[PDB]
Amino acid sequence: GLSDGEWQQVLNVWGKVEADIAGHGQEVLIRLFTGHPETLEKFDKFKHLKTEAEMKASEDLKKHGTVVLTALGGILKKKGHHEAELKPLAQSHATKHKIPIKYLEFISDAIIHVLHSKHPGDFGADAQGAMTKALELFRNDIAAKYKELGFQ
Numbered sequence: 001g002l003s004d005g006e007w008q009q010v011l012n013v014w015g016k017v018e019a020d021i022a023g024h025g026q027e028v029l030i031r032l033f034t035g036h037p038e039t040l041e042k043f044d045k046f047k048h049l050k051t052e053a054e055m056k057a058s059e060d061l062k063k064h065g066t067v068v069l070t071a072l073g074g075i076l077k078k079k080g081h082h083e084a085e086l087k088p089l090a091q092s093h094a095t096k097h098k099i100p101i102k103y104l105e106f107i108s109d110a111i112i113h114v115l116h117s118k119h120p121g122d123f124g125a126d127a128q129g130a131m132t133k134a135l136e137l138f139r140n141d142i143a144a145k146y147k148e149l150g151f152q
């Protein structure tokens, strides 16, 4: 649960992402894959990537980063009223992709890391607080659907 002022911070930060969605999406995925190499094994289309240089050169990885962040941005713009947008993603991630909730924690922290890396000194303590709360809400509502499905 976020206040109006917190949502305002979230959507202000998101404007930074929307200025270069593919570059942010690329770096988020590279941070996830290099920090947590077990996550790469969930992607049949990226498992061939052995080095970060290969990851950086991959146009399909940048494409997938655009898909991921476009979906997250659509959810964030709902300011918590995201049941319809979140349900299909929870279902596909539990039943088809088999993504444990832990990996959603990993990517949440990766988003925070990339924001500081690309906007050093321009991602303030209030903005980090609000973004973290928004990603926690997203993860918690997915977790509720995972529990319904019995997925671990």
Ligand code: HEM
Residues within 6 Å of the ligand: 039, 040, 042, 043, 044, 045, 067, 068, 069, 071, 072, 088, 089, 092, 093, 097, 099, 103, 104, 107
């Ligand atoms: C911010 C969180 C994320 C968002 C919004 C997101 C969004 C999406 C979307 C929109 C798709 C395509 C449609 C679908 O299959 O449902 C997708 C595919 C996928 N997601 Fe996620 N995702 C997230 C996190 C992750 C994480 C953490 C992993 C794994 C570590 C992951 C693994 C996958 C895989 C394996 C695919 C299928 C890729 C394919 O082969 O083309 N997702 N995701």
